[PDB]
Design a protein around this ligand. Structure first.
Ligand SMILES: CC[C@H]1OC(=O)[C@H](C)[C@@H](O[C@H]2C[C@@](C)(OC)[C@@H](O)[C@H](C)O2)[C@H](C)[C@@H](O[C@@H]2O[C@H](C)C[C@H](N(C)C)[C@H]2O)[C@](C)(O)C[C@@H](C)C(=O)[C@H](C)[C@@H](O)[C@]1(C)O
Ligand SMILES: Nc1nc2c(ncn2[C@@H]2O[C@H](COP(=O)(O)OP(=O)(O)O)[C@@H](O)[C@H]2O)c(=O)[nH]1
Ligand SMILES: [Ca+2]
Length: 295
């Protein structure tokens, strides 16, 4: 694989320090290779795991084009090389806030989970408010999923019905979901460009736990911004959720009075996502997580 990497890089006019090549296999869509070029700059090489690379990454690249065009408070991958055989970009500054350990079923944290630095929330709030305000509507030909506020609500309604039809859903959980769907005042009246897979493994931080970059824009779309807040709630609890909401609101992010409550209900719909992923991915672990999560 190392020899293959060097050759693939060479074909794309990328020349590496062989001794620096390291593999990261945590991605389900790409093998990721870290390597320095001959000027000592750190690169990430995305080697696709499945065919039809161009069609399958078109959406992500459109989102990255928007972020690279508009955003200044955080870095996002800037694909200098982009072919069916290789995506390569300069590695973002900083390190992941945490990485998922699948055996343990939780994070290996770079930050102190018992004393989370308040700068993490302040900086993530800035990042998300900037991201969610990007004017995606100004693009001439976007292939991203784009929802109005009403469409985002109907999307959830439909996704829930589809999960119910295939997996079934416990009566009380279903009723909670429906109460959320039916409560007008809880739903946001603005949507935005989201990252869609915001979590510690994708949030790059500096030594002070400032979020300085976001990787992996596979799930980018224009919809309810709430999905980008779920990680804070699940990792840090209500306090971390409140801190992020506060920072986001105060820097000018779209805020509505029931935003926290809405995000908590979205968190209660976590099983929808697990069930969907089980279906598309065929990964046994997600199938069993889905069965237990749906009750
Ligand atoms: C707290 C600690 C837990 O972290 C979370 O709850 C975060 C906050 C989830 O994101 C939350 C929040 C959010 C928005 O994703 C960031 C949401 O979509 C998912 C379902 O749950 C993560 C990351 C999920 O991943 C995402 O699952 C998607 C179905 C696909 C997505 N990706 C490959 C396309 C992928 O990253 C998912 C399912 O939990 C991963 C599996 C492996 C786990 O069950 C692990 C062990 C988690 O319980 C966790 C680490 O312990
Ligand atoms: N530290 C760091 N890790 C990265 C970077 N880019 C990718 N990775 C790692 O490589 C993994 C796979 O790349 P990613 O684009 O997420 O691929 P996917 O998960 O298959 O869609 C990521 O989840 C990270 O763990 C980067 O700029 N910095
Ligand atoms: Ca990833």
């Amino acid at each position: 694989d190392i020899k293959q990497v060097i050759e693939i890089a060479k074909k794309h006019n990328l020349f590496l320090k062989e001794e620096t090549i390291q593999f990261n296999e945590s991605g389900l869509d790409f093998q990721a290779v870290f390597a320095q070029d001959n000027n000592g700059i750190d690169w990430v090489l995305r080697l696709p795991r499945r065919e039809d690379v161009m069609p399958r990454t078109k959406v992500e690249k459109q989102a990255l084009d928007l972020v690279n065009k508009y955003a200044i408070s955080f870095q996002a991958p800037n694909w200098i090389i982009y072919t069916e055989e290789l995506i390569a970009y300069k590695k973002l500054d900083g390190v992941p806030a945490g990485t998922i350990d699948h055996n343990i079923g939780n994070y290996i944290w770079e930050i102190d989970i018992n004393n989370v630095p308040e700068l993490f929330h302040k900086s993530l709030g800035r990042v998300l408010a900037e991201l969610h305000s990007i004017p995606s509507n100004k693009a001439a030909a976007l292939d991203l999923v784009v929802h109005t506020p009403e469409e985002a609500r109907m999307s959830m309604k439909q996704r829930m019905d589809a999960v119910r039809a295939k997996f079934g859903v416990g009566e009380n959980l279903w009723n909670r979901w429906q109460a959320w769907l039916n409560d007008d005042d809880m739903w946001p009246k603005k949507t935005g460009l989201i990252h869609g897979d915001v979590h510690a493994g994708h949030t790059m931080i500096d030594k002070d736990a400032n979020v300085t970059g976001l990787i992996d824009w596979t799930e980018a779309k224009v919809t309810d911004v709430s999905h980008d807040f779920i990680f804070n709630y699940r990792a840090f609890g209500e306090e971390g959720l409140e801190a992020l909401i506060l920072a986001y609101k105060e820097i000018g992010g779209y805020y509505w009075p029931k935003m926290k409550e809405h995000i908590i209900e979205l968190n209660a719909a976590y099983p929808v996502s697990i069930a969907e992923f089980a279906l598309v991915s065929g990964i046994e672990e997600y199938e069993q997580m889905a069965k237990e999560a749906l009750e």
